[PDB]
Amino acid sequence: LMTDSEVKKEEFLEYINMVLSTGEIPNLLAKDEREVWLGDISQAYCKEKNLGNIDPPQSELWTYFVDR
Amino acid sequence: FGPLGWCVPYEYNYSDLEASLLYIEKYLTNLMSTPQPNSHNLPISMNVVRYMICEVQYGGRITDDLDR
Amino acid sequence: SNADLTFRLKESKEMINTVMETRPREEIVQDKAKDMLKNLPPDYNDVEVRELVSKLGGPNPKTSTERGMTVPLNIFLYQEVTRMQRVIGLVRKTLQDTILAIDGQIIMTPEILEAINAIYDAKVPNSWLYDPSGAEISWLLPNLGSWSTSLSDRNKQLNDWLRSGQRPILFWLTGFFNPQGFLTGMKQEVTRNHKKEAWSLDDVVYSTTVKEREKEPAEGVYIKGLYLEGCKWSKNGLDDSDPKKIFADLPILHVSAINKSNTYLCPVYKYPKRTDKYLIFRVGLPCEGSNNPSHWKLRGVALLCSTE
Amino acid sequence: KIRTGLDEINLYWNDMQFQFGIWGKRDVPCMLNGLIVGTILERLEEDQLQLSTFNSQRHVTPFKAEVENLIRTFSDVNDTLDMWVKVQKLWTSLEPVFTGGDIARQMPLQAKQFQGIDKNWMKIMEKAVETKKVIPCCQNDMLKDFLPDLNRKLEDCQKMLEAYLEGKRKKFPRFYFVSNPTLLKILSQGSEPTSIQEDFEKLFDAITKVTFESAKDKKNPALKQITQIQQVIGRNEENISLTGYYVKCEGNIEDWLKKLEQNMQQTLKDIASAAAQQVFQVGLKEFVSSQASQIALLGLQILWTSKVNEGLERLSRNERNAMDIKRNEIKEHMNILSSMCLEDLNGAVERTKVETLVTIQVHQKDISMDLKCKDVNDFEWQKQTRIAWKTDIDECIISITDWDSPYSYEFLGAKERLCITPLTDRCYITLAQAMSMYYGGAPAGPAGTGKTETVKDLGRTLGVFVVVTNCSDQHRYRDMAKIFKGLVQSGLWGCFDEFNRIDLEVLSVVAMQVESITTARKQHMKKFMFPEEEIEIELIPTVSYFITMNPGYAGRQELPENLKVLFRGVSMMVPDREIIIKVKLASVGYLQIDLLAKKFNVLYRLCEEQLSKQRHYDFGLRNILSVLRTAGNTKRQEIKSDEEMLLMRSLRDMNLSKLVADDIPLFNGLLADIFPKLKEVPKKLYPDVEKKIPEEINAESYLINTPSFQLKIIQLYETCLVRHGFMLVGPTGSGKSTIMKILTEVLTKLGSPHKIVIMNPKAITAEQMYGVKSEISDDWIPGVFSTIWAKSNNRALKHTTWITCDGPVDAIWIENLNTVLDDNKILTLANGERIAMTENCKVVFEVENLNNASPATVSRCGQVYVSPTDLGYEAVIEGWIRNRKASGRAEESDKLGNILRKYLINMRFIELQSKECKEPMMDTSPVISVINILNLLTGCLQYFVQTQRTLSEQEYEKFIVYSMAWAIGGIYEAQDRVRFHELLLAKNAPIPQKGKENETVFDYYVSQDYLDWKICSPEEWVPPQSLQFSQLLLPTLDSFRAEMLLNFILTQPKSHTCSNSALLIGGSGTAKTSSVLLYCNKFDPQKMLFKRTNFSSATSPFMFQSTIEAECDFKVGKEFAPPGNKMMTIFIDDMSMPFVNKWGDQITLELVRQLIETGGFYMLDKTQRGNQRKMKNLQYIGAMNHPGGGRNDIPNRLKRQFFIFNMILPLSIEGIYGPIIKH
Amino acid sequence: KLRQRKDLTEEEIVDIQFRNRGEGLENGEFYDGQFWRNIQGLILPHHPKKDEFIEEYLKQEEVRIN
Ligand SMILES: Nc1ncnc2c1ncn2[C@@H]1O[C@H](COP(=O)(O)OP(=O)(O)OP(=O)(O)O)[C@@H](O)[C@H]1O
Ligand SMILES: Nc1ncnc2c1ncn2[C@@H]1O[C@H](COP(=O)(O)OP(=O)(O)O)[C@@H](O)[C@H]1O
């Protein structure tokens, strides 16, 4: 719920702009944290994508995360 | 008047004045320091003072040629 | 005395305006500009112009056959046409893209908005006078009253100096972007055509005789359009109360090899702003009578070129 | 061969030299450094060059297991060593600090912290001693953690020690003109001779070497004492000065420095006191040959004034010829000096001395000819710089109109003082008056009229030492206070060049400081109080202030009215130009002086006015003096030919380089009008280089020699030979970088090596370029460009470094290099650090063209202009042809081209505006199109290169038609495309004619399997998911043709002129990310990855730096990145949107351009500066939005690299959404 | 003498004969000291009417051989 009160300079608009476009903040989530948070999610992946309930991969978890 | 009188504006003030006064008082004091008697109050050759008040004291501000 | 006059006017002109402040666009103006842009002349394509300048040229038809590069005035013709076209293209393009934002479509520019505001007011936009460093072209006050008028006159004379290709009499010095090149080209012409070698370039010096006559080739040029300030041509006298800026008669030039204080020396300023820049050349004006030259020097005479 | 190349290098590199230099054994442990490490570093560099050279070649199967490990170790050991040695320097500064008892007591805490670091450091040293070999020593892992934390703590220790540094600076003046850490190094001598022998330059004016004689005192170790002083210029040429009074080293550094200064002053005084008798006793030649330069000039002046005086009184007694006899004596002296000492002489210093005398004597006799003054009191005699060496009170005294002051006795040796025009007399009188009233002159005018040099010369003649600095916007008042304190304490003169370009409030407080000192000096008070500085401080009278401000540019403020009071103005608008020339020609020793002077003046004037107006032209005094200092040698050569010939040759051949194509005829037609006697002369041609150039031009594969290259490269050689630095102005794709590279090669071939560094100034912030004071922790950071400077200008090297800036020329960053590019050739910082230039180094700019340059930077450096027609696109095509006859040389070069030559030369210019084509959305120069079509055609034929199959002529003609259909057709709309198509029908090789049912040539493609023109889009529906994303995208025609074009370029393996980079153009909402993402899904993430990014207006270079660093996550240059070994792609939606600066040059894309062109960039992690990360593998793709009008455009220099083509709307949208409705 | 073999000019002979730079500049060409230029700074591969100079030197050389 950003409004005119929630802008004090341009820069906020830049960060939100890229949030609309990509959603990956450079090294906000990758400060040695992306892997612990992603590891807290693969249990859902075991049924969600359902790779025959066998296995998964590593980068594809980030792909599913940006998707979510 | 404007450009008829001076090509651009110049900021003459008193600093140049008492500079010139300090010069010419030195000149007269050290002229008459050797004068044991004044024919009619002085024996000055006032052409150097012309050159000084022309080109040195007031010459600082002047950026044009014609103004010289 | 007449100096007084101008001062008071500008003084009065601001004073009321001060108190005048204390009291409690995108319309047919762009259509007026739209009608304007179909009145300035067309471009001159260089593929045609290089041809035309190469086809015909000489100082004197008897002296030489037609030729291009070699004669200074032809290369000057090419340089002047080049800069003129450089300005013409810019004006046509920006008028277009100023009107092609509303009637046309494009994401609005700040420069174009400034251009709109300038078009409504008297002052032309900065886009046609200056650049980040400096690109002074023809800075005059009005939008079209004199600015485009001056540019039109320049292009008219330049075209007739080209399309016919014949050298006319009574050159207009104000039109040329670089007057000094005109004069030095005249020098080179005299050295080559005459006394060639008997006369060296560094030996030649300069002088002028004022054609004291109303009603009227040899070496030198005929200049039209200079303006004096504060006396007559010859038998110089005190100016009357009105008519501060007076015409200048035909000051035909003269050049001579060197050596082969009653005289007074005047400057020649392009614009009436009067700086070190715009000093094209200096002219000796012997017409003294009883008043010694220093009288005139303090009186600040000059032979300016434009009148604004 | 290659196995030998690895074997013997391994045999040597395992068995390396291990010789190290120990500081001393003065405790249990020993601390050491490698004084051979230059050999280590350099031989390492070409080692890794050799190893990469091998690995890149095809036939290097086995070495990968071995070589990588080897390179890895080498790479790794380097940075460890570097960190270590840097820490050593820190420790090597701080040891003598904590040896003293009082300072260690007064701050116990960090003294014990230093006890702790001493323990840890000794442990590291003993581990290294145990190892005996530096490579296992570096291999230790524990070390690496300690080293940077130790570094940070030692920075903290220095931040403790500033409080003592201020007092130590107080105890001796000159240290105010020295920065902090170099002051620490100066104070940690640890030796009499060695430590300070490399620092005499930046602590006195002109001294560089001093002998050290050990006097063996009884039971004390022999003390080294100074006995003579030396000024070295060049290599062997020098000036020596004995001393009778000696100077002895001691225990306190301030003491022997002070004694050095004093005893210098005293012996200079006494030698002069003698020399003033010898001048009139011995006679002219003997004392001029015997004495040094400074004393000789003093002697000449004093002789002339005394004799002229004597003549004037003798006139006063009665009408006498004796005044005329004295004038005649001077005239006689002229011939004897001029005849012999000028033409023949040994050595540079001795040479400079003579003409320094000659110029003075010329002016001397010129004055004495017209000197119609009746007596001493006359003004005409009381207008020049007279001198009197008073005997009754033994002292010099120099005199002006009224002012007087004593000579300040500073040894300068031979300096190239300058001519005396009347304008210099106006300055001399003005400055003498202002100093008599206790002010500071502040001359003003346009650029290059002799302001700074006039100030410096009035300093030199009065015997004082001047200290030029260079203010800039990154200054702070503390450093100005430091300077002014040094000035008042010492007795020296300051000349704050470019004083105006400085912050406003800093000027506000400087007003106070200078007013305080003015009032202090006015009273004649020995001791005074300085603002902001609590301790009381003394004064010496003979000080002065000068600012050479520059009225009116971009980035120039005004002086608030508090500060205009102090300084008196001196208007220097138009320098004289004739008298200086004529007296310089006299100084060299010419005979046709007066005519030639007029020739110079008139020629340069006419050239200035009536020639075409271009921004980069310059004809000021810098150019003229360059010509003069050139012209000395030519007369010094044996030829007695007529001078005017030599001079025409010199002028013409100097000024040719800058001129654009058109102005050359006008220039030499103008030459003919002034020297009609002379017809022509050949250009003096240097045989070695001209024979050498074709050799390496043939050595390369893809290089065609043409005469224009000979001309331009030789001109570059000459301007290199004369001037400091230079610029290569010229449009894109014109061969500038190649010219520089080949020149460096030829110079290196005949010995005398040459190295080149590159930089991009507007892809880093100027604050980082020159470094600032940190805005958080109150502590300095190093600057990149200054780090390269310090690393480069060390003596005792063999390179000849050429620092290349490469970008635009914006005034703000460049203009604070005026001092380095001026005759001062000294760099000055806001740190307070001053670094002296050497002849080892040159500065070059590979800039396109100036549009934001004042003449103060145009006239400082020489220049060379490349033109578009010097290297036509055709020559580039022939170079590619030379490559095709390298390996695929069966017949292909001939066959391919037999269409290409006529099919390209006589066609390309009939598309620009023959037919209308009036919407080329991307305005370009057509060389880019040629590079494009060549890069496309190589990918077209790559398949049949792969299978080693050679085809007929007709198929090749079809291929060329296909290639160049796009890549000149990629920038047009359907209407222009059909007109294009009709052209190709009229006058070109066959296009599809089988059906052509209202379908353009673009619609079809040539098939590899057979000579056919077909096209289709394969059927494919969706997966079962129903999310709109799961209905991602469908197989369109537009997408398929886009993949078709893209894939060709993207398969090509990094050929020259191929960056492997692409770029689309299409309206906002014309299937950009659609087609790109369709491509991107088809990647194989097992050996091919991908990355996304977007652009907005306020995205800065630091942001792009961050995202690319996070993308790679490794420095793949130093044998790293297993996970980035797969190939990656960087995709950007819109390169236009970044904010164009006001000038017109946007500052974000430049980082990208240095990334594409060269790969890598400079780091900014507050730890090390001069070094760059390297990208050994990457890929690049972009997308535009129909530039023009409201939409921005990219820098034109960057357009040369990306494949560009349109992305039209589909016109088939009934057939895109059909399937989803079917399902 | 012979136009086929004896007339065959060596690069030294060619360079000296060009270095004579006698005439032929009816259009107007600049110094032959380094390079000829047609109009505006445009290098010319050769002196414009070189052939007449070749013929003149061949005539003189035939007289010398006589
Ligand atoms: N002797 C040569 N023969 C054939 N091709 C050449 C030769 N010299 C240069 N080239 C080609 O010219 C191009 C050189 O462009 P260069 O990189 O020099 O441009 P530049 O002048 O440095 O300007 P920018 O740095 O902006 O590109 C390359 O494509 C190169 O292959
Ligand atoms: N009277 C002179 N005699 C000799 N050289 C001069 C004279 N005037 C100017 N110069 C030359 O001009 C250059 C100095 O210009 P400078 O004063 O640095 O320009 P700026 O004042 O714009 O910094 C030097 O090469 C210097 O020798």
Ligand SMILES: Nc1ncnc2c1ncn2[C@@H]1O[C@H](COP(=O)(O)OP(=O)(O)O)[C@@H](O)[C@H]1O
């Ligand atoms: N092949 C396709 N199949 C289905 N939808 C498509 C296809 N191509 C384009 N579109 C739709 O058209 C739109 C075009 O938007 P896009 O090209 O991303 O904007 P821009 O051109 O500014 O990048 C997309 O949002 C997409 O939904």
